[PDB]
Amino acid sequence: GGTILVVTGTGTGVGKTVVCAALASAARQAGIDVAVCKPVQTGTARGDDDLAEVGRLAGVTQLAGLARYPQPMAPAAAAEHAGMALPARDQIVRLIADLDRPGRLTLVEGAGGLLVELAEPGVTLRDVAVDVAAAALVVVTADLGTLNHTKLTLEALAAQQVSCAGLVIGSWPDPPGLVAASNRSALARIAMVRAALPAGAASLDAGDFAAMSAAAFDRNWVAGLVG
Amino acid sequence: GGTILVVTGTGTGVGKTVVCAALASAARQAGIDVAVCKPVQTGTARGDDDLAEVGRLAGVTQLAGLARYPQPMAPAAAAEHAGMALPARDQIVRLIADLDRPGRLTLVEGAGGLLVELAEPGVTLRDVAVDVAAAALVVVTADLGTLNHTKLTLEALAAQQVSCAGLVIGSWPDPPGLVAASNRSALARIAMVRAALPAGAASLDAGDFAAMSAAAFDRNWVAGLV
Ligand SMILES: Nc1ccn([C@@H]2O[C@H](CO)[C@@H](O)[C@H]2O)c(=O)n1
Numbered sequence: 001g002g003t004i005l006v007v008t009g010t011g012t013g014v015g016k017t018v019v020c021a022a023l024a025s026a027a028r029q030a031g032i033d034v035a036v037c038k039p040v041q042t043g044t045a046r047g048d049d050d051l052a053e054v055g056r057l058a059g060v061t062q063l064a065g066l067a068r069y070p071q072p073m074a075p076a077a078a079a080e081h082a083g084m085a086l087p088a089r090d091q092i093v094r095l096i097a098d099l100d101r102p103g104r105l106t107l108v109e110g111a112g113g114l115l116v117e118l119a120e121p122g123v124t125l126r127d128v129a130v131d132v133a134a135a136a137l138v139v140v141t142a143d144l145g146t147l148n149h150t151k152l153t154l155e156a157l158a159a160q161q162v163s164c165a166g167l168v169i170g171s172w173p174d175p176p177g178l179v180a181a182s183n184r185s186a187l188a189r190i191a192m193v194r195a196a197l198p199a200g201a202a203s204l205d206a207g208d209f210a211a212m213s214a215a216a217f218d219r220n221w222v223a224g225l226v227g
Numbered sequence: 228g229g230t231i232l233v234v235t236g237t238g239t240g241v242g243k244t245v246v247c248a249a250l251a252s253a254a255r256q257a258g259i260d261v262a263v264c265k266p267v268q269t270g271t272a273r274g275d276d277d278l279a280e281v282g283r284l285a286g287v288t289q290l291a292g293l294a295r296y297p298q299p300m301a302p303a304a305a306a307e308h309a310g311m312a313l314p315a316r317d318q319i320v321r322l323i324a325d326l327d328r329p330g331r332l333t334l335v336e337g338a339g340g341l342l343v344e345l346a347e348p349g350v351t352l353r354d355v356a357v358d359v360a361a362a363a364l365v366v367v368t369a370d371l372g373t374l375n376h377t378k379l380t381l382e383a384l385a386a387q388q389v390s391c392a393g394l395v396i397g398s399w400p401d402p403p404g405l406v407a408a409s410n411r412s413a414l415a416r417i418a419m420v421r422a423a424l425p426a427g428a429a430s431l432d433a434g435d436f437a438a439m440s441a442a443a444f445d446r447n448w449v450a451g452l453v
């Protein structure tokens with residue numbers, strides 16, 4: 001196989017989807033074949049489609065979905081509101097292992113945070129990480145409360161021996177406020193900050209995003225994810 | 228001695244102080260002696276003092292604290308920006324133990340969420356709850372994301388064998404709304420929801436607040452605390 005990464009966040013609305021796109025765009029630019037997998041998508045009735053947005057920002061075509069639910073809610077609630085069932089654990093692992101292949105970076109974007117339920121009963125992105133043996137890239141904010149949320153997410157990763165690939169501040173303000181600046185420093189003492197994506201990165205066009213992505217991440221880290 | 232309950236939140240700005248006040252009010256109105264200890268406070272530049280807020284809302288007089296930083300940041304960063312260290316783990320645990328006496332519900336209010344640095348060296352509210360054999364009451368929101376944050380926090384509690392005294396929804400919105408209605412049922416499926424506090428209860432005078440507080444909590448669970 002290749003390298004599988006679950007992209008998770010300390011919370012909802014932290015920029016996971018554009019981090020996903022950024023690392024995909026940066027990894028394409030290092031000659032790495034990228035597949036992006038969103039096994040559970042909610043809010044489709046409101047237009048939400050994270051796989052689609054990764055294609056528009058990162059130019060990725062190897063996009064893999066599975067479950068889509070209309071209501072913008074936690075997957076368990078969005079499914080029930082629509083009379084549909086959650087997928088099974090093995091249906092999600094199968095979707096991932098099928099995309100996997102050597103020399104490929106496969107990105108698995110979660111639904112909201114790490115312990116959100118994606119399959120019955122209480123199956124989470126973290127259990128999926130264990131099954132496909134993936135490390136976890138954690139997307140964070142620079143805002144107040146980030147440290148507690150980051151530390152909680154990291155502790156939950158370690159408790160199942162899932163590897164932390166590092167953090168990404170999903171939306172970085174220019175100029176940084178005082179709060180944002182201390183949080184960025186405090187976050188680096190917690191773990192490695194692989195990138196800090198500029199706010200508004202999702203309104204960039206194809207070339208601007210690709211440029212942004214190549215500068216956001218350390219080339220050597222990106223290249224070292226696939227061997 | 229008595230009962231020591233730590234009150235923590237899944238995050239900042241979730242109504243943790245109001246919940247502290249409301250539980251203190253409800254407990255007093257069952258004839259329980261209540262103290263509230265908030266070791267570290269921040270944000271006292273932009274007009275704060277959560278202990279004063281508890282005193283005004285709940286009428287508690289045993290209000291104990293050790294440190295206050297003006298910056299609206301987590302302790303460690305407010306302390307760092309201040310040029311002045313956080314209290315020692317010793318100071319906090321000894322103060323909580325000094326407060327704790329028979330018949331008394333001593334509430335311990337954290338600074339932010341469960342796992343931020345509270346004392347030296349790198350001690351958290353979780354370490355404090357362990358040292359004083361305190362259960363933890365977790366304040367949660369009803370908004371999208373609460374279920375993740377609440378599992379994360381309950382997992383962090385169980386990991387160190389800190390008992391969980393239940394959850395409290397800090398701000399119940401009016402009208403509820405689609406996700407909040409769902410989360411309430413979902414939250415009730417992870418842990419006992421001791422109360423959901425109406426939004427805006429901070430602006431209430433003392434008589435209204437105490438009436439809201441008596442209504443909010445199950446009178447028999449409040450009394451069984453002590
Ligand atoms: N670096 C970032 C991060 C996020 N966003 C936008 O903000 C929302 C998620 O944070 C989403 O609406 C996303 O498009 C952005 O534009 N740039």
Ligand SMILES: Nc1ccn([C@@H]2O[C@H](CO)[C@@H](O)[C@H]2O)c(=O)n1
Pocket residue numbers: 240241242243245397398399424425426427428429430
């Ligand atoms: N049930 C609640 C909970 C919170 N609040 C107010 O909202 C602010 C943010 O937590 C709090 O500081 C407090 O002013 C409220 O009014 N009623």
